[PDB]
Amino acid sequence: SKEESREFMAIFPDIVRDLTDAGRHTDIPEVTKRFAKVLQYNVPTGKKTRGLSTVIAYKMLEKPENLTPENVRLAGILGWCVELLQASLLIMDDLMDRSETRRGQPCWYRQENVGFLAINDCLHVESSLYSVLRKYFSHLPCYVPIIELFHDVNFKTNMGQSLDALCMKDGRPILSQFTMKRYSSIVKYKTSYYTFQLPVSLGMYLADMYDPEQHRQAKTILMEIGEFFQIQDDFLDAFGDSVGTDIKEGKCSWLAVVALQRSNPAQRQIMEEHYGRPEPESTQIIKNLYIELGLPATFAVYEEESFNIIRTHIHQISKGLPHDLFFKAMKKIYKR
Amino acid sequence: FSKEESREFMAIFPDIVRDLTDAGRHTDIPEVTKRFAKVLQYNVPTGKKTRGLSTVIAYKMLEKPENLTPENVRLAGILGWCVELLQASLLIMDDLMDFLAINDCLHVESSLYSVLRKYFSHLPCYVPIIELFHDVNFKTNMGQSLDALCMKDGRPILSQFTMKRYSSIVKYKTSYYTFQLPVSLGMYLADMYDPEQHRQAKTILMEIGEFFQIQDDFLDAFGDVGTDIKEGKCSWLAVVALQRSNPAQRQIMEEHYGRPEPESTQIIKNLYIELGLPATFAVYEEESFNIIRTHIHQISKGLPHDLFFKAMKKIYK
Ligand SMILES: CC(C)=CCC/C(C)=C/COP(=O)(O)OP(=O)(O)O
Ligand SMILES: [Mg+2]
Ligand SMILES: [Mg+2]
Ligand SMILES: [Mg+2]
Ligand SMILES: [Mg+2]
């Protein structure tokens, strides 16, 4: 919605001022001005789906009579703390992957006189969201649960990143590690917690929903939606309309995992030889093998089956949680 | 630090590793939790844990003797290990920038908040403590960035080497997390929340922090291994050299400061000797010692002298 996008974007400039121009650290204006540019470059140029989903989650969890402009704005500020967390992770991930571009612009680490100083900027941006939480939430009962959620999700996302790294040795993929079990774990910890659980749990906390059973039931369905989301993303890297590099980078992708499940030994040897090679021909050989194993058809079947299984699980969701919130998320991801 | 203090502090470390690597929770990701255990084990508990043990000593000298139970001294130890987890994250980041993965520094920093939640979430000091770590982390990152703004394209920006910028770099990059953080944690655990008590403690500890780094900078060049000159660091020696230099002496700093050639390091050292930086350091060491001793003697707001005298005498030896 137009109103939601505009209300959300209007908050960002206030957060930059809160972090760089609140009359604090006035002895060091050169580093506060630089930090403004770090935030301005890395935080607000994406689709901001996670931050906006934090607002939508709150709007569907809170009692209608409690939805004031002021409370909706607080949900906006929590949304931007999610976008600050993501900004920090992607600054670091782009350095780790040595990627060229993110959101159509040169990766932050490639900018002049940054490189490995991107590590410090990563830590700085992540640290900044706790300053935003203190300013706007320190007087509310959801303060400590929200701080704890952000620290725990950061920890879990790091476990996800590190598990991803244990699928590679010396810039070569370990194909024996590419099991559906490990893939599912990587998706859960590396992406699902910060993408799906974090926005909804923030919505619940701001709506003073602290029942751990409610958070556990929410998590169960959001982890399942998370798995389809990443599997679809993995499928599109290879078979989407154009610039995917999963094959070249030797990533533990759903396609690589399913390919290795369905491969005869000669097909296996093509993966061993060619998966994660920098030569464009090697990328084409893996793509050709994926076509040969019928992965497009496999994905189409998984897309229909997973949709039906998740919708079934949403209907079984115990009273207290709005089914509409989870159906709305499914509708966003499946476009259906 | 006493033998009993060192041993009871060290006995906590294996508990923290098990808390962070989910031992007995039966995790779905044992391969990466076992790796993280090794990250903590290899990088956190080795050498002198001076910040960690200082947190315990600060607590013991701030708390009412009646409240110094084994249980409370152990909580001071865990707070100390949270400071050592922060120290370990900062060392890992320095190592990456010069087995460790790039995200290990973020992960180790993140882990201290898991430890604070586990052991302190029930205490009135919980929120002040986590807010202190948040603010110190932010300020440390600012210090690191300000240090980086003294270098461009691998060449030092000598116009940036002012005493004001130096003092700021030390305060933000080092002093907040090394000197203030241990004492503030001790105060919070002892239920000392008075902002004026934290402010008076902060004033003295920032002054001790400045001497610590100036002495460290002095010894890098004149100690009995040092690379500050080669790396083109914003050192107290470089700053004072530029204050004292005539134009011909400035031109030697421009030409030779931050060069990889060993000869360039010797030229800068010869200039430091010429400009009388040894004697200038000796004068500053005496004047700073007397000013800090005076501030400790004048310490009010019901703060104990002996904690600050002990910190001062440890750094000045
Ligand atoms: C601890 C850290 C730094 C976590 C990284 C989290 C993250 C979302 C990385 C992107 O993974 P990717 O490289 O598979 O995806 P993308 O295509 O977005 O780069
Ligand atoms: Mg990447
Ligand atoms: Mg990556
Ligand atoms: Mg992708
Ligand atoms: Mg040194």
Residue numbers in the entry:
A (entry chain A): 87 to 328, 334 to 427
B (entry chain B): 86 to 183, 202 to 327, 334 to 426
What does the paper say about this structure?
Here we characterize a metal-dependent, bifunctional isoprenyl diphosphate synthase from the leaf beetle Phaedon cochleariae by structural and functional analyses. Isoprenyl diphosphate synthase in P. cochleariae (PcIDS1, EC 2.5.1.1) produces FPP in the presence of Mg2+, but preferably forms GPP when exposed to the heavy metal ions (HMIs) Co2+ or Mn2+. Inter- and intramolecular cooperative effects in the homodimer strongly depend on the provided metal ions and regulate the biosynthetic flux of terpene precursors to either biological defence or physiological development. Strikingly, a unique chain length determination domain adapts to form geranyl or farnesyl pyrophosphate by altering enzyme symmetry and ligand affinity between both subunits.
V286 and I420 form the bottom of this specificity pocket and act as a molecular ruler, whereas F282 and F315 engage in π-stacking with both allyl groups.
